[PDB]
């Protein structure tokens, strides 16, 4: 597998989203905000932003 996950997933590390040691933000089962600050779409992100120049 890719260089990143080795011990299942959970455990160790720390969640920089909630601040709970054991999991990561990417493994945060409790999302929030993460609202496109480009279009304002409080759901999708730039990686999922089909918008380029507003249009
Ligand atoms: Zn979390
Ligand atoms: Zn967007």
Explain the overall architecture.
0% of the residues are buried. The chain has 55 residues and is largely without helices or strands. The chain has no helix or strand. It has a single domain, classed as HIV-1 Nucleocapsid Protein (Irregular), CATH 4.10.60. The protein binds zinc ion (2 copies). One zinc ion binds next to loops. It is classed as viral protein. The entry lists the keywords nucleocapsid protein, dynamics, zinc knuckle, HIV-1, zinc binding, Viral protein. The assembly is monomeric.
Largest sheet: none
> What is the first-to-last residue Cα distance?
40 Å
- CA gyration radius, whole angstroms: 15 Å
CATH topology: HIV-1 Nucleocapsid Protein
Which superfamily, in CATH terms, is the homologous superfamily? Zinc finger, CCHC-type
Q: Helical element count?
A: 0
Overall domain count = 1
Overall morphology: elongated
CATH class: Few Secondary Structures
Count of extended strands = 0
- CATH architecture designation: Irregular
Strand content: under 5%
Percent of residues in helices: under 10%
Small molecules (ligands, ions, cofactors) in the structure: zinc ion
Structural class: little secondary structure
Protein name: Nucleocapsid protein p7
Zinc finger (CCHC-type): 13-30, 34-51
Subcellular location: Virion
């Amino acid at each position: 597998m890719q260089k990143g996950n080795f011990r299942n997933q959970r455990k160790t590390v720390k969640c920089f989203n909630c601040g709970k040691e054991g999991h990561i933000a990417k493994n945060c089962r409790a999302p929030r905000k993460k609202g496109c600050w480009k279009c304002g779409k409080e759901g999708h992100q730039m990686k999922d932003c089909t918008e380029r120049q507003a249009n």
